[PDB]
Amino acid sequence: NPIIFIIILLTIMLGTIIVMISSHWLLVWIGFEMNMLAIIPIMMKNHNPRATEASTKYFLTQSTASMLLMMAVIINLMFSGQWTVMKLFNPMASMLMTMALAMKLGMAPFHFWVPEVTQGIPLSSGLILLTWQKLAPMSVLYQIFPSINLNLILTLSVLSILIGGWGGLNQTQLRKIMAYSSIAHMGWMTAVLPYNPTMTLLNLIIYIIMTSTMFTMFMANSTTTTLSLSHTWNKTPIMTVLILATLLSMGGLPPLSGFMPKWMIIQEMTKNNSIILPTFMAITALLNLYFYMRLTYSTTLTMFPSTNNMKMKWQFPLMKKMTFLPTMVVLSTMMLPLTPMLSV
Amino acid sequence: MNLMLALLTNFTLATLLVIIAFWLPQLNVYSEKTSPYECGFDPMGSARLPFSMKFFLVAITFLLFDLEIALLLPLPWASQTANLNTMLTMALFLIILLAVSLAYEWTQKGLE
Amino acid sequence: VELPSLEDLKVQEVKVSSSVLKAAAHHYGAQCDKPNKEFMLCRWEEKDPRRCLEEGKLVNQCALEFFRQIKRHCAEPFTEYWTCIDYSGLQLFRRCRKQQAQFDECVLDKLGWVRPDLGDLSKVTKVKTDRPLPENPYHSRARPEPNPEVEGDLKPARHGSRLFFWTM
Amino acid sequence: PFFDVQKRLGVDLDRWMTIQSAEQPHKIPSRCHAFEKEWIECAHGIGSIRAEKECKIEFEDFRECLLRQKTMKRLHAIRRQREKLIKEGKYTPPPH
Amino acid sequence: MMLYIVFILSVIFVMGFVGFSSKPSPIYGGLGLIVSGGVGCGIVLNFGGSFLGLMVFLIYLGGMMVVFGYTTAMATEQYPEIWLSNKAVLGAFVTGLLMEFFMVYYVLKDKEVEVVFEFNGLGDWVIYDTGDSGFFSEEAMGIAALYSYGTWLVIVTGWSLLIGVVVIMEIT
Amino acid sequence: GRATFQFLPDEARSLPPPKLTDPRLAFVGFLGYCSGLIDNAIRRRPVLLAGLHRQLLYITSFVFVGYYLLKRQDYMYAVRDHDMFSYIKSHPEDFPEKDKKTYGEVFEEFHPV
Amino acid sequence: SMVYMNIMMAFTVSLVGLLMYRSHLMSSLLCLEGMMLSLFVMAALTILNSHFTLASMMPIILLVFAACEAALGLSLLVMVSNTYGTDYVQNLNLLQ
Amino acid sequence: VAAFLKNVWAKEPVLVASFAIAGLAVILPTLSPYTKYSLMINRATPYNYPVPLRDDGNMPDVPSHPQDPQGPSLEWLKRL
């Protein structure tokens, strides 16, 4: 059990390297095939009958989303027979390409892949491992990029934040509130991808950091929003101040560094005489903030710590790489004149 | 063009003899008591077919040992070749890659 | 496209069977060597087998005389040689190995040929400068022109990072 | 992103099995081998954004080598050139 | 015997799928695949590559189609039924059955009707279209399976299966 | 833009290098100076002047890495302008010379309130 | 030719209404394994007439994962019947 | 440890016979000089056709007549 838990966990990131290290559509088929093979055990570990009825709702959604990709390869096998990863030489192939791959990253259509899995997996511990599967197909859309129809990639992305926004105001379960606003932060980056496909990766590296540091804060006890009340005056009041800082940073407010992407990403979206496109989305992520305010109105205002239970003992979990996350996820807005010249 | 007329003879002779046994000499309209009998030498089995775990793992285990003999299948065609240090050292890999999959599972089989 | 006429066809065609063609077949190729090896350069080194029709008849016309010689001099052990090898199934060469020397009792001696054991069918040869060397192949149309390069000189940023305000 | 490790250190992870004219283990080419080698000769140092509108001749015939689209249409229309005149003579050619 | 022996196989193969694509009570689902798997192998056993067709019997039809029928007893063991004896099965069988003929009906049975539906014609002997002949090497298709050049290919697919057992050595 | 898959290529020798006592390198690690203080504050230390050996090596980390990071940032702008000026130097038809005209040529609007 | 239209019509054995519905989920996993041989054949018809000589190892490798894939998916479908006894896709508890 | 190769061969001599054939199989191709003749035989079996070359300056070797002493040493097999 302990050693074989690494070898399963090691090959997840070995599956996604072959996706990136490839000049050949057959190897990118194998690449995130075996990821869909080596995630299914991590879903299981404590064997609860929601988890078995959740990974099977996870499974076949990523079997078909696999299967249409191999259909898209064999079409432009017939046309000119080159198999390098490049433009796909056929509009009937690229159309079938992009909205096949839109299930693994799930966009606004291909909807309930995101809440129905992440809710109620008893492994809420992590499930930070759902950042690799947002990272493998983005490494495929960097090459396919100069062959798309420019309407479909925006219509999946204009719907992305308009429906990833509305979906979670009606929630309490903070795994769903993390599952929502994970379609929204896939809406900002693929709205930009036809226009200068770098300054997309800037949004992604920020998104890995701010989301990974959100789950590590959650690993004391936290399950529900009512449980997010009862740890200010019990566990540590410094935790309440920290959990305020990242949310207000992840909303995009200019004293913090989640405003670092947008500020730069509109420098590219206009400069291309497209003005009505960002003004819709920039005003759309505003009610993506009413998750976070009304979440911060729970923990930071002493809202009813009742049912007197004392934690007179210390804490010994492993908060690994936590001391350096809200020091590059908040304070970096002055210190990045060019992060987009390292990553470029 | 006989391959394909080498077997459609053999199946139409097969389906001939079954209908001159199941049909024709048969038709049991007389007494032919098909009552509640014919229950396979028993009575009423109010239970359905129950799951048996030790007779499911025998299905999956075979399937994963069945695949990489088809990888192992073009070994005689891999003889008349070029560079053969590669051909030998890669052929020995898959067999060991089949052999380890025994030894891990070999520490837990069950009453198979 | 343009094709040659119905003439420069209909040559004296070798009308033999498969086994009698494979009967001698071994003494055949290893001793003519002028029309046929040069015909390969007429097919490999330049393609389009519509240009190359002369040496297609040079290999054919000499082969007409190869069988014409073997009929007059010694055909009594020849006809029985491809008799037994035509007793079919794969046309093996180890069945009539006994009767092979009764054919070759005099082919080395009477008309004076040789047995090309295993040195044939390899050992790439040269012929002679026979046709003008076909430069400018099948089309070889245009390159076209590339993009010109920059070497220049690497001096640093002109006033520093030029992003929004961002001096240094 | 496309890291391209296999250009730094010279192993071919794959590469060989990518295009129609690469290695051929005993040197038996394809049906359109002559147009692959000709078309790849066109766009090498070209950055492929001007290659779509400049070369455009060595690619189109190669597409029509592979599917034989108009060759089958020039053949199919000869079945309608004749073969309503089955009864109006001109067998053409007599056997053989 | 005709020139149309390939086209007459594939229509069966198309109708093999519509057999089990609707809802046949998953023991006749086996009688949709083994029909199609052989008829589909009837296509592939032309064109030269016979080794690649005969493997579809051994590893697919011999391996997976036992286990797919070695289940449906240990699970889904309710009282069985047959398709077409209900109303929901026959209502979907005919729906593609017309188009299984209607696509054939005008692709080329008209002269040329008119511009868009005449680029691909039926027949004639240009379906194979492989003249002229070759050499005594192989088909080939014969000298293709290689423990030469591809080594990165095999070292993954060997190792990807080795974790295939260890994922199933657990939960069950 | 050539010589692919390097962290920073060979041709970055003629760049200054970005030597120290620049305020970014003071700021890089100042946040690390803040980060080590957080590292005590999470765990109920209850010191806020705790073990210095944990409070050191954060300073050493960011400053070393951030220096070794900035050598390619100044490279990438230096390779940016290097390719623009060459395309400015060729093709003069895309870069005309504008005429110098003083305020004796323009008759502007004229809109007073 | 028409040997590709049939079979590209036969690729519509996905059809998504019958790729997860209705109940007896074994009927849906059926066409997931039966969606292969519409890819195994549609590749094999193209590599074989156009003599690529090397890409015909890819249809051999196309089965090897999809067998191991579906075998994994069949393991979990026992686990839905190990807890119940019936698969019945109108089982739903974890909302979305 | 020298009893372990004799006190498991009294209990299960089944897998011991497997390792004895698993071993002494990888070892031997690094040993006998019969190998690399297995690559030497396998190199000079002609499948395809030998295309000729052209004289241009060189003239290195191997003139138009094949039965001349022109080519390399592959005639040690007939003596073998």
PDB file of C-alpha atoms in Angstrom, chain C residues 30 33 36-37 40-41 44-45 114-131 133, chain H residues 44 46 48-55 59-67 70-75 77-78:
ATOM      1  CA  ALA C  30      25.990 -13.407 -64.772  1.00  0.00           C
ATOM      2  CA  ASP C  33      26.095  -7.882 -68.231  1.00  0.00           C
ATOM      3  CA  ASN C  36      20.865  -5.210 -68.562  1.00  0.00           C
ATOM      4  CA  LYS C  37      22.917  -3.560 -65.808  1.00  0.00           C
ATOM      5  CA  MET C  40      18.930  -0.377 -64.528  1.00  0.00           C
ATOM      6  CA  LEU C  41      20.712   2.976 -64.677  1.00  0.00           C
ATOM      7  CA  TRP C  44      16.780   3.921 -61.533  1.00  0.00           C
ATOM      8  CA  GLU C  45      19.070   6.860 -62.226  1.00  0.00           C
ATOM      9  CA  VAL C 114      30.864 -20.832 -65.577  1.00  0.00           C
ATOM     10  CA  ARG C 115      28.934 -21.470 -62.364  1.00  0.00           C
ATOM     11  CA  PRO C 116      28.274 -18.153 -60.519  1.00  0.00           C
ATOM     12  CA  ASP C 117      27.900 -19.680 -57.048  1.00  0.00           C
ATOM     13  CA  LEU C 118      27.155 -16.801 -54.620  1.00  0.00           C
ATOM     14  CA  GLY C 119      29.140 -13.796 -55.883  1.00  0.00           C
ATOM     15  CA  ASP C 120      26.239 -12.765 -58.109  1.00  0.00           C
ATOM     16  CA  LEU C 121      23.195 -10.688 -56.991  1.00  0.00           C
ATOM     17  CA  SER C 122      25.356  -8.288 -54.965  1.00  0.00           C
ATOM     18  CA  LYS C 123      28.532  -6.225 -55.479  1.00  0.00           C
ATOM     19  CA  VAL C 124      27.241  -3.013 -57.090  1.00  0.00           C
ATOM     20  CA  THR C 125      29.138  -2.296 -60.326  1.00  0.00           C
ATOM     21  CA  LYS C 126      29.797   0.558 -62.744  1.00  0.00           C
ATOM     22  CA  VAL C 127      29.142   0.479 -66.463  1.00  0.00           C
ATOM     23  CA  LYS C 128      30.416   3.479 -68.526  1.00  0.00           C
ATOM     24  CA  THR C 129      29.369   7.088 -69.253  1.00  0.00           C
ATOM     25  CA  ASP C 130      26.711   6.109 -71.784  1.00  0.00           C
ATOM     26  CA  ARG C 131      23.941   8.683 -71.824  1.00  0.00           C
ATOM     27  CA  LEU C 133      23.931  12.552 -67.033  1.00  0.00           C
TER      28      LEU C 133
ATOM     29  CA  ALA H  44      24.314 -10.480 -46.565  1.00  0.00           C
ATOM     30  CA  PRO H  46      19.806  -9.981 -50.439  1.00  0.00           C
ATOM     31  CA  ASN H  48      16.047  -6.173 -52.879  1.00  0.00           C
ATOM     32  CA  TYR H  49      17.823  -5.637 -56.180  1.00  0.00           C
ATOM     33  CA  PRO H  50      21.402  -4.341 -56.422  1.00  0.00           C
ATOM     34  CA  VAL H  51      21.238  -1.122 -58.422  1.00  0.00           C
ATOM     35  CA  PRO H  52      24.587  -0.275 -60.086  1.00  0.00           C
ATOM     36  CA  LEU H  53      26.694   2.895 -59.841  1.00  0.00           C
ATOM     37  CA  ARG H  54      28.467   5.129 -62.365  1.00  0.00           C
ATOM     38  CA  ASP H  55      32.141   5.757 -63.188  1.00  0.00           C
ATOM     39  CA  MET H  59      36.654   3.994 -60.366  1.00  0.00           C
ATOM     40  CA  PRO H  60      37.293   2.830 -56.750  1.00  0.00           C
ATOM     41  CA  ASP H  61      36.905  -0.917 -57.458  1.00  0.00           C
ATOM     42  CA  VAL H  62      34.381  -3.432 -58.886  1.00  0.00           C
ATOM     43  CA  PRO H  63      34.194  -3.133 -62.702  1.00  0.00           C
ATOM     44  CA  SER H  64      31.345  -4.198 -64.996  1.00  0.00           C
ATOM     45  CA  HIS H  65      32.146  -7.915 -64.728  1.00  0.00           C
ATOM     46  CA  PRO H  66      30.817  -9.403 -61.467  1.00  0.00           C
ATOM     47  CA  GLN H  67      32.811 -12.649 -61.472  1.00  0.00           C
ATOM     48  CA  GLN H  70      35.962  -7.322 -57.214  1.00  0.00           C
ATOM     49  CA  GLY H  71      33.647  -7.490 -54.213  1.00  0.00           C
ATOM     50  CA  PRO H  72      33.895  -8.224 -50.489  1.00  0.00           C
ATOM     51  CA  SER H  73      34.230 -11.486 -48.567  1.00  0.00           C
ATOM     52  CA  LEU H  74      30.839 -13.191 -48.337  1.00  0.00           C
ATOM     53  CA  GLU H  75      32.106 -16.446 -49.871  1.00  0.00           C
ATOM     54  CA  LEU H  77      29.640 -19.416 -46.184  1.00  0.00           C
ATOM     55  CA  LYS H  78      30.053 -21.892 -49.047  1.00  0.00           C
TER      56      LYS H  78
END
